[PDB]
Amino acid sequence: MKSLKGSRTEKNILTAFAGESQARNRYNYFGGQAKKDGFVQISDIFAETADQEREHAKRLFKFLEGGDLEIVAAFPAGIIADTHANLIASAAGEHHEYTEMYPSFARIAREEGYEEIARVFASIAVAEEFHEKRFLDFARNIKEGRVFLREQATKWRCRNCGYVHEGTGAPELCPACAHPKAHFELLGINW
Amino acid sequence: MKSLKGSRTEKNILTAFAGESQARNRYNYFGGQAKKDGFVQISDIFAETADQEREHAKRLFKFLEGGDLEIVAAFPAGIIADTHANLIASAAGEHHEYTEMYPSFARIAREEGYEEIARVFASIAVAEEFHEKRFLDFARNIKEGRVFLREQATKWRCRNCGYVHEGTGAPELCPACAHPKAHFELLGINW
Ligand SMILES: [Fe+3]
Ligand SMILES: [Fe+3]
Ligand SMILES: [Fe+3]
Ligand SMILES: [Fe+3]
Ligand SMILES: [Zn+2]
Ligand SMILES: [Zn+2]
């Protein structure tokens, strides 16, 4: 790694920075619509994904040493729909990104002598693959009615107050904090 | 349920509100010390628990219809230590609460004709039991060196950027966002 200035990798980094910046915003707006649709756990994962996009953008932006730079590129023009649709559009763009755009960008960085940047573009691809995965399972539970209803009794946690509930479905109201079903999630352990 | 004024349940609600308010603060301070100790996932669970305490306090506070009211009660006087110790003090107080204090308070509410409040005190007890559980497993992994090291290869997620890593231990540095190991957690699915 030399200088980036004038290289193709230089425009590739700005282009990625540009689509990741917009993605932060759309995930943030999709999070607010999810909360409105009554899926608090899905709202918080949009917001988490938003924040992780900010951090992919920041590692990238830091490679730039430049001034003003012109790019040609395509981006979704809209749109905010119902949550299911939001989760499908998101997944589709995460898809294009880990299967198409970052493999290429990594290739050329590599090919221009920037292998570290190449690493970074490959590592981000990994993250976008989990993001898509997440978005697809949530969209499938929405499509199959299993957000707030499972087939054998399991335990549900209140995101708002931590209340735990043994049942096949979450309660219509939290007995502890009196927030509605929308606040409930599958209880999970990850330690 | 009548009026609460003058009842014993009346002082019980304020006393619980008082210990839960302080608990919010101590969990918030324990979260900052955890971040300093290099346990980001544990930092965020302190902060989450803090927020759930706020919401137990709020359901309670809303039952009050009163003016100024005198209480006698004991509270921890201090202290902020290392994270392990923080997790053990927290668990001990969560313990006293679900095994002793809220069972009683629920009893008397019940016994004074306030069964709904009684429910609420029982439902909060449930939440505090999961909180303790959480705190104990994290303190055990800290004691056994398994926060950031497992015995068979498993996958670790970067909290900062979503990067996923297959291995027995988390990386020393995230390849995607270049944040240190402290940001990694066991990857979990709960949908
Ligand atoms: Fe992504
Ligand atoms: Fe609740
Ligand atoms: Fe608690
Ligand atoms: Fe990372
Ligand atoms: Zn990204
Ligand atoms: Zn509480």
**What are the C-alpha distances in Å from B80 to residues B27, B40, B51, B87, B179?**
10, 17, 19, 10, 26
Beta pairing class for B184-186 and A164-169: unpaired
- Asked if residues B83 and B64 have their Cβ atoms less than 8 Å apart, the reply is no
Which of A24, A116, A123 to probe by mutation at the B interface, max B CB count within 10 Å?
A123
Cα–Cα dist B126/B55, whole Å: 14
Residues forming beta bridges with residue B169, ordered by sequence position: B149
Residue A1 Cα to ligand 1 midpoint, Å, equals 26
Among B90, B100, B119, which residue's Cα sits nearest to residue B24? B90
Q: How far is CA B48 from the centre of its chain?
A: 7
Which of B164, B188, B191 faces A190 most closely, judged by CB atoms? B188
Query: Identity (one letter) of the amino acid at B52?
Result: Q
Cα–Cα dist A105/A8, whole Å: 9
DSSP, collapsed to helix, strand or coil, labels residue A114 as: coil
- Asked if residues A4 and A114 have their Cβ atoms less than 8 Å apart, the reply is yes
Q: Residue B155's closest chain A neighbor by CA? A: A190
Residue B56 Cα to ligand 2 midpoint, Å, equals 8
DSSP, collapsed to helix, strand or coil, labels residue A165 as: strand
DSSP, collapsed to helix, strand or coil, labels residue B142 as: helix
Please compute Rg for chain B using Cα positions.
Answer: 20
How far off is chain A from B129, nearest CA to CA, in Å?
Answer: 9
Question: Cβ contact (<8 Å) for B185 and A190?
Answer: yes
Q: Domains plus CATH for chain A?
A: 2-146 (1.20.1260.10), 147-191 (2.20.28.10)
Cα–Cα dist B187/B99, whole Å: 32
Please compute Rg for chain A using Cα positions.
Answer: 20
**Main-chain phi, psi angles of B5, to 5 degrees:** -45, 120
Cα–Cα dist A161/B55, whole Å: 6
**Main-chain phi, psi angles of B149, to 5 degrees:** -160, 120
Give chain B's length.
191
Q: In what order do the strands lie in the sheet with B164-169?
A: B164-169, B149-158, B184-186
- Asked if residues A143 and A84 have their Cβ atoms less than 8 Å apart, the reply is yes
Question: Resolution of this PDB entry, in A?
Answer: 1.9
Q: Is B145 left (phi over 0), alpha (psi -120 to 50) or beta?
A: left
Cα–Cα dist A71/A87, whole Å: 28
Cα–Cα dist A77/A85, whole Å: 15
Residue-wise DSSP of B47-94? HHHHHHHHHHHHHHHTT---S---------------HHHHHHHHHHHH
DSSP state of B147: S
Q: How far is CA B13 from the centre of its chain?
A: 19
Cα–Cα dist A96/A187, whole Å: 32
Question: Cβ contact (<8 Å) for B59 and A178?
Answer: yes
Residue B187 Cα to ligand 6 midpoint, Å, equals 27
Which of A55, A120, A160, A165 to probe by mutation at the B interface, max B CB count within 10 Å?
A55
**What are the C-alpha distances in Å from A90 to residues A178, B90, B110, B163?**
32, 40, 50, 18
Give chain A's length.
191
